[PDB]
């Protein structure tokens, strides 16, 4: 669905509001 | 017999009404910044707001 290499997919699989936000 | 649930900073995430014992979620009301999109004032003076 997203044009990623198999190595990229493996890499992405391995890595895992009280007045302040995230952007 | 449980009443409510606290988050990390003593921020409650639940409540039970003293009359009708019901579970009620609670979330903060929205807030955020306001930004203005503006082309060069040497070309026009029409802007947009995000």
Breaks (C–N over 2.5 Å) after residues, chain A: 16
Method by which the model was determined:
cryo-EM
Report the distance separating Cα B21 and Cα B14, nearest Å.
12
CB contact at 8 A, B11 and B24: no
Helix (H) or strand (E) holding B29: none
Q: Is B9 on the interface with A (CB under 8 A)?
A: yes
Chain A residue with minimum CA distance to B11: A18
- Which residue carries 């044009």 as its tokens? A3
CB count within 10 Å of CB B19 equals 6
CB contact at 8 A, B36 and B48: yes
Q: Please state the φ and ψ torsions of residue B47, each to the nearest 5 degrees.
A: -130, 170
Q: What string of DSSP letters covers B14-48? A: --B-SSS--B----PPP-----EE---TTT----E
Report the distance separating Cα A18 and Cα B6, nearest Å.
14
PDB resolution in Å? 3.3
CA angle at B28 for the pair B24 and B32, rounded to the nearest 5°: 160
Chain B residue with minimum CA distance to A17: B28
CA angle at B20 for the pair B17 and B24, rounded to the nearest 5°: 45
């Amino acid at each position: 669905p997203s044009k990623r290499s198999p190595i990229e997919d493996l890499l992405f699989n391995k890595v895992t509001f009280n007045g302040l936000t995230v952007l | 017999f449980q009443q409510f649930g606290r988050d990390i900073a003593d921020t409650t995430d639940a409540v039970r009404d003293p009359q009708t014992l019901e579970i009620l979620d609670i979330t903060p009301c929205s807030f955020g910044g306001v930004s203005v999109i503006t082309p060069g004032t040497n070309t026009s003076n029409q802007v947009a707001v995000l």
